[PDB]
Amino acid sequence: NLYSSLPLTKREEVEKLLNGDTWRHLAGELGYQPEHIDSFTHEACPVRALLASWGAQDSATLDALLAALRRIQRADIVESLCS
């Protein structure tokens, strides 16, 4: 159940919810080192680019993402995405 496969419309909502610093926290939890995170701030849309990059692995499931969101104490985002 790959994250990539997710329709643009829900992905759009994912990205909206990872606002501010949250994509950085998520990236840390996903195994990205801080300088690797910093590299993504060069993109026009750091959060999308991070997820496009991460989303190219085979392990990059929606549920893997939700789990990483739980692990950074953002279950509110999970609740929000699921409701």
Ligand X SMILES: O=C(O)c1cc(S)ccc1[N+](=O)[O-]
Chain residues in the site for a second copy (CB under 8 A): 8-9, 12, 15-16, 18-20, 22-23, 41-48
Residue 18 is given by DSSP the state S
Residue 35 or 58: the one with the smaller Cβ distance to a second copy is 35
The residues in 58-77 that bind ligand X, with binding defined as CB under 6 A, are 62
Q: In terms of CB distance, is 6 or 49 closer to ligand X?
A: 6
Two tokens at 26? 């998520």
Q: Which does 81 bind (CB under 5 to 8 A by kind): a second copy, ligand X, none?
A: ligand X
Please give the structure tokens belonging to residue 50.
Answer: 């991070």
Q: Which does 36 bind (CB under 5 to 8 A by kind): ligand X, a second copy, none?
A: none
Count of beta carbons in the 10 Å neighbourhood of residue 23: 25
The crossing angle, in degrees rounded to 10, of helices 22-29 and 62-71 is 110
